[PDB]
Amino acid sequence: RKESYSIYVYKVLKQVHPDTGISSKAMGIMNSFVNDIFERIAGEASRLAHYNKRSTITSREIQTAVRLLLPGELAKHAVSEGTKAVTKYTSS
């Protein structure tokens, strides 16, 4: 009953290691990993919206949640990556 992100994780794997493959057991782990993080980030964004009496989750709540949930450098790059995405999406 959980989302599958397989197609997408395959695509990312090829961008990073065109050479290497991934077993189904491992794909099952990656899917659990994406759902987990998705849930942590959205749950926290939801808490933030509620705390501030805001009815809408925006990319700001997502960003703050990401800062709160991820450790040091990983949070810095994630924030950077999120920002780039929104910037490019907003332009194009």
């Binding site: 290497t20 994406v34 749950g43 990319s59 790059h77 999120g82």
Partner: protein, 106 residues
């Protein structure tokens, strides 16, 4: 045929799907258009980091197919990923090879 939202944001992860999953979970009354873009981008980045480290771990073991063991080795050997996933159990991931110095011979 319309350009996908993922395409417009320079991503592989599904912006469209992510926005729908965000609405299906009732996390707030409304979900802004940028939220799923920012979220999808973070999920992709994290996925790339782990695949990156895991692919490596697979090479170090003369292997070409990433298995649970490699994901575990990659996570547990990375200080930040290991902290992010501190309460996570990777099925068939095993443990990091490590013996307390006190137990080894002189």
């Amino acid at each position: 045929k319309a350009k996908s939202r993922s395409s417009r944001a320079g991503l592989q992860f599904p912006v469209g799907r992510v926005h729908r999953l965000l609405r299906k979970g009732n996390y707030a009354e409304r979900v802004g258009a940028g939220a799923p873009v920012y979220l999808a981008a973070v999920l992709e980045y994290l996925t790339a980091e782990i695949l990156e480290l895991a692919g490596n771990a697979a090479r170090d073991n003369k292997k070409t197919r990433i298995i649970p063991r490699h994901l575990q080795l990659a996570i547990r050997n990375d200080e930040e990923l290991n902290k992010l996933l501190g309460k996570v159990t990777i099925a068939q991931g095993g443990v990091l090879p490590n013996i307390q110095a006190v137990l080894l011979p002189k």
